[PDB]
Every structure is written in structure tokens, then in C-alpha cells.
Amino acid sequence: DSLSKEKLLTNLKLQQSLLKGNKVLMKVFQETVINAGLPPSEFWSTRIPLLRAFALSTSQKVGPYNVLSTIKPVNKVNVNLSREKILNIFENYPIVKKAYTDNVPKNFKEPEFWARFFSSKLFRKLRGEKIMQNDRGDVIIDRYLTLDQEFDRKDDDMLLHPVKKIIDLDGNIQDDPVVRGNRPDFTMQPGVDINGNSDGTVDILKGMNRLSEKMIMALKNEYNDERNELKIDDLNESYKTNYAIIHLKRNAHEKTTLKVSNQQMLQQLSLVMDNLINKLDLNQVVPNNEVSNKINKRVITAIKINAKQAKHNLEVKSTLPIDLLESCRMLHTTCCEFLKHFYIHFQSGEQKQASTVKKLYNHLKDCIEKL
């Protein structure tokens, strides 16, 4: 798809946006690609993960949610609308985008359109509130109202599909068609007004069911099972791990670039025994003022070497001025970039690009000449 290597190499607009974002990559790209003449594909061959991260920083989007449920007032009342909320309103509800297309560029501007929508009956209907005739609504948005009702039947036209027999409730009701028993009373039937027609709460029940169905079905895009469902997982056998087991041999080769008999061993040990039993005079450890001087001299030379090495170890301060230090830093940066490209093309080892490696080699020679 769009995340493949060649797509990231060929996406010039994404690379342009990444350069507009980054700051040190300005200096690197300016002093390598602009001046020394690297191919852009060569420069972006080693920075595929950075391009992919910048792509995934903006290409991903939030999941659908009830955006009109979040919009609540706070005499003056204020509501805040983010552009992400506007996009969620457009995605979750096609009727609002339909009104936006033929109302905003034509007659009245965007905030007037949103105020008219929030003061309309359509906002009360899509939120799930009971529609009342005493409310004025808005005379511009309400012409879309029946059209939105059209959308609802088209919603049924994309939602009414046959289901499995595990949860088939239409087969539950129609298990026998000749049920003519006691009619369910008014507690088990939808509520009606004084004239006998429905009060309209079944309308908002169907509306919230339709909204949930639309949210679930929006996930299904490009972005025998009944036996598996009815089987009890506990009564089956537990999972046995199939992890591999290794055994390590310690028959390694010895590192490559005097025999003593037991009688010399034993007589040396006996000499140690008689030297230990008689008098273990500790004062003999004191040196004779010459080997002590030699040992002290060796230790002072070693610690002088170690102190000279470890006297000094954010970059450290230097005697170089800022301009010449920065020139040396950019020359080192472009030389290292050339070296990295040369080595990755050299050890990649395709003959067809091998001559291109020669070009880098010439640039490497120029790098030497540059120094």
C-alpha cells in the first residue's frame, strides 16, 4: 500500500512536509543533497523509518463516536466547535455535509450555517430528542429533514441483511405463523397517544440503534463458525506450549594466537609446612629500599598514564570559534553521510547499482579532496 518503501521514496510532498517540520535535517539536506549532489532516493534510502513515522503522525484518524452527544450548551450560552468535531459531524452524518455543500458556498457562511443547524429541528432529531411542534427550528435546515428521513430508509437498505440462525429473532417470531393467542397489552406494546398514533419514542430508539449500527459498519472497510461458537472451551484440553528446547555443548576450542611430578610437588609442600610451623615472621615483608623504589616508580608511571588519559572524558568546549567549528561539523556530517551510503551500497552488493557506488566513490574522493 502507501506504506511500502517505494511509496515513501516517491512521495515528494511528504518529504517536503518533513523538511518543513525538521530543523537539523534542513542543515543535513542542504549541505548534502543541495550542494554535494546526492540523489533524493539515495538520501531517503536510509531514512525510511523517519518518513514512515512522519506519515503515521498524520495519516491515522480517530474512530467514529457520537459527536452530537458531546455538543452541549456550556442569558448567553456558548458551544465550542473544533475542526475535528466538524469532520466527525460530516463523517458520522451525511445529511449535515449534504446541507453544507449546497448552503455554505452558496448563500450564507459557515458559522451562520452552524448556528442555524444548532437552532434547527434537525439537531434535535439527530441527537435523539423528542421532536416537538412548538419549537420554531430553522426554516432553512428543515427542508432537508424529510430528505434525512430518505437517508434513513437508505440506511435500512444498507443494513437489512440476513443473519445467522443462532440469533435469528425473525425466525423466533415466525417459528409458527398461526399464533393467535392473547394479544400483548399496552405494557408490552409501544406507547400511543390519545388519538392512537405512536408518540415517537420508538423513532429515537430506532435512531440510536441505527447510529450504533452505522458506527459498527463504518469499521468494515479497507482500513461452520456456529460450531466454534457453541463449543465449550473449558471441557477441551488445555493449551500445551510448543516452545523449542535447545541444548548447549561446551566443547569449544582453546584460545590460540610445564609438567611437574608429584614428588617435587610433595617436597615443596613439606618445605612450606616446615617454613610455616617454625616462625612466620611478618617483618620480612618490608622491602630493601630499592625494590620498593622500583615498585613505587612503576606505580607512579602507570598512574601518570592513567591520569593523563582520564583527566578529561552536550559536547565539550573547544578553542575553535563557532564558525570554523560549524564548518568542520558540516563537512564531517556530509563525509559521514557519503561513507554510510557508500558502505550500504557496497555491502548490498547488487551489480546493477555497482557503478552508482563508483559515483559515490568519486564523491568520496572529492570528500578527501574537500578535506
Binding site: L3, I48, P49, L50, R52, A53, L56, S57, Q60, K61, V62, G63, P64, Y65, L219, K220, N221, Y223, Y239, T241, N242, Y243, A244, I245, I246, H247, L248, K308, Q309, K311, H312, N313, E315, V316, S318, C328, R329, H332, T333, C336, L339, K340, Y343, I344, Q347
Partner: protein, 383 residues
């Protein structure tokens, strides 16, 4: 018949009703050690590439974890990064957070732990908000674990604090893609057992349902994060047994600072790469000039102890004749622990190693199996 408080005094002082007393404490530790009896050297993937996913939603503002879930998960993530790069040095790590339904990358996949420490410290200042998205985080984790080589096992760790997730697409397709790219996912949930996380862990770990972990308290979270630094055992079906070409750099000692090849800054020391003679700042890392791994021998030796773990020490029976009255490693006075004269000799604290038949106390039983990784009796034996 009447009101509740006029019935009778509650009498709270009288509800409390009141030698071999050590045995009840010993049997709990015995039951704890019973779960660790079976052990064998599983093959484990040493070279790891871990993507740590951290939840940063409104559900992370819950007060049930002192002080708040966001800050303490970040602090234990800092500790996790330190332990993970202490015990798995040649691994790589990236950090992704879930915020406002967006997956946010805060650190690129790199072997330097200090960058991840800085990223987590930068996260700790901001506040969590939004509604988390597993699918976006898993998709960026898949993108981050695309360019790592086949010899390196690709792993994703998710600290998912919420109970519901909002996705821009079908998450089962993402699970299928994660399984097809051999990415293993372990999820440490905070509240309860979410279905999609359990299915993701079961699918991406070849049918093992034990990779979805739910904590109990503060200490169990430390236990889980300490368990997570060990490399996961690989399956038998995986055949990516691949040679890795790497070099061992030489630590140079110069009194004149030089330009490093990785950051282009003044560094006094450095490690000369054996392949291209360029110098690097930190270790272990890939060389910026030749794309070759540079590690030390201690970096192999640190993870070498996972290859042959030591068999667990078995507590000796009290009826057996004791080999030694003192420990082999520290000569700790083994307590006779005589509770009473009729109670006799019980629960002797001598622990025997199988390969060398030497006795150790509980202190050395703790130390030889966690910090050290060689039994002193096994190397004292003239084999």
C-alpha cells in the same frame, strides 16, 4: 421490632476472640516454591525489538492507584526501560502512547536507553486525555517493526489502562496482520479482562492465553514489569535461525577530542569500529557508517544466562543426615529452628543443588537464582 440503632449495642470489643507456629509461615513459602518446581532451558529470542505502548486516556486519571495511573505507569516504564536495557543490551526499543484516539510516537526504535528515558520524562509533564485506540497503536507498532531483521524477534508490550477502545477500522484485520508478521503482543491491563486484548494476546502468541496480565496491587505491577524484561520463548515452528554479522569495537584513548560518526559532536573517548574505523559514542549500537552491530563481550554475557537457567534448589528433608551445619557459600549458621522439644527438628533451611550436592541457605537460594547465575558448588566441583 423497631429502629436499627435502638436494638442493641454493637459490642465491637467482643467480636475479637483469642509451639509449631513457624509451620504456617513455612507452608506458604512451600506453596509459592511449588509453582517454580518445573524448569527446563526453553530457547529464548535474545535479540529483541520491543514497542512499549502506554495508555494516556481519561481513564488513566482514576485515583485508585496512588497518585494517578499516568504518572506511576510512566515511572515504572522508566524503571522498565532501565531494567530492559540492563538485561537485554543488544535489543532495540520504541515508545508509543495512545492519546485522543491518536497513536503518538515519542521515541524512534533505537538501542540507546537514555533517549527513551528523556522521552518518558517529557511525557510525564503532560496530562493524559482522550479515548484510546488499540488499532492505531498496533498499526504504528507494525510500521516500526517492519524494518527490523528476521533474526530479531518483534515484540509489542501494551500497558492498556482503559476498558473500551475506539478504532478507525476493523481490529481483527490488524490482529491478522500482526500474526502474519510474527509479532508477539503481551498486554498488561489495569482494570479488567477486555475481550479484544485477550483475543489479540491469544492470536499473536500461538494460542497461549497467559500473555494477558491483570494486576492486583502496587507490588504486582512491579512483578509484572520485572517479568516482562525476560525474553519470550520462541516456538518450534520458527526457522529464522540466522547468523548476525557484527564487530567488536576497540575503546580508543585520545587526549584530543574528535568528531563522532553518530552525533557529529566532540567526544573525548569513543569506540573504533573494526570494519570502517569510524568511532561511536555509546554501546551497543549499529554503526552509523557501515550498518554493522557493535557490542562488547559483556553484552553477550549479560543475556547468556537466559540460555541455561539453573535448576531450582530443592529443600532437603528434615529426616536426612545433614551434609554440613554451615552454608557452602557464606557459612550461615543453619538454624535448628527447634520450636519445642516435642515438636522436634522441622523445616530445616538447607537447600540442595542437584548438580553438585551442596547445601545453601535461603539467602544464597535468593542470590544464586536472581543476581548471580552460577552455583558456586557446581564450579567448585573438579569435573
Amino acid at each position: 421490632g423497631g429502629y436499627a440503632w435502638e436494638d442493641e449495642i454493637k459490642r465491637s470489643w467482643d467480636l475479637v476472640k483469642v509451639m509449631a507456629s513457624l509451620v504456617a509461615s513455612i507452608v506458604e513459602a512451600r506453596k509459592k516454591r511449588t509453582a517454580k518446581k518445573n524448569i527446563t532451558p526453553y530457547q529464548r529470542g535474545i535479540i529483541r525489538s520491543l514497542i512499549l505502548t502506554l495508555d494516556c486516556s481519561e481513564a488513566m486519571l482514576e485515583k485508585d492507584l496512588r497518585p494517578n495511573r499516568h504518572a506511576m505507569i510512566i515511572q515504572y516504564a522508566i524503571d522498565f526501560v532501565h531494567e530492559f536495557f540492563d538485561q537485554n543490551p543488544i535489543s532495540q526499543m520504541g515508545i508509543i502512547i495512545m492519546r485522543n484516539g491518536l497513536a503518538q510516537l515519542v521515541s524512534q526504535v533505537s538501542g540507546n536507553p537514555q533517549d527513551h528515558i528523556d522521552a518518558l520524562k517529557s511525557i510525564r509533564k503532560q496530562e493524559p486525555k482522550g479515548n484510546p485506540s488499540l488499532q492505531n497503536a498496533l498499526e504504528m507498532a507494525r510500521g516500526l517493526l517492519l524494518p527490523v531483521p528476521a533474526h530479531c524477534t518483534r515484540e509489542v508490550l501494551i500497558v492498556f489502562g482503559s476498558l473500551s477502545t475506539t478504532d478507525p477500522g476493523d481490529i481483527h484485520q490488524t490482529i491478522d496482520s500482526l500474526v502474519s508478521e510474527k509479532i508477539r503482543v503481551k498486554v498488561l491491563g489495569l482494570s479488567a479482562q477486555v475481550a479484544i486484548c485477550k483475543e489479540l494476546c491469544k492470536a499473536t502468541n500461538y494460542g497461549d492465553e497467559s500473555f494477558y496480565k491483570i494486576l492486583l496491587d502496587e507490588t504486582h505491577l512491579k512483578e509484572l514489569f520485572n517479568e516482562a524484561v525476560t525474553p519470550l520463548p520462541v516456538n518450534k515452528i520458527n526457522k529464522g535461525f540466522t547468523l548476525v554479522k557484527m564487530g567488536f569495537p576497540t575503546r580508543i584513548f585520545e587526549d584530543t577530542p574528535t568528531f563522532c560518526s553518530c552525533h557529529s559532536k566532540l567526544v573525548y573517548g569513543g569506540y573504533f569500529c573494526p570494519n570502517c574505523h569510524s568511532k561511536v559514542c555509546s554501546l551497543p549500537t549499529v554503526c552509523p557508517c557501515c550498518d554493522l552491530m557493535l557490542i562488547l563481550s559483556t553484552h553477550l554475557a549479560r543475556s547468556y544466562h537466559h540460555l541455561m537457567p539453573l535448576k531450582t534448589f530443592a529443600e532437603v528433608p528434615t529426616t536426612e543426615k545433614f551434609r554440613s551445619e554451615d552454608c557452602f557459600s557464606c557459612q550461615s549458621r543453619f538454624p535448628i529452628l527447634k520450636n519445642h522439644k516435642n515438636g522436634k527438628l522441622l523445616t530445616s533451611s538447607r537447600y540442595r543443588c542437584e548438580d553438585c550436592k551442596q547445601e545453601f541457605c535461603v539467602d544464597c537460594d535468593v542470590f544464586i537464582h536472581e543476581i548471580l547465575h552460577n552455583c558456586p558448588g557446581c564450579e567448585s566441583k573438579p569435573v
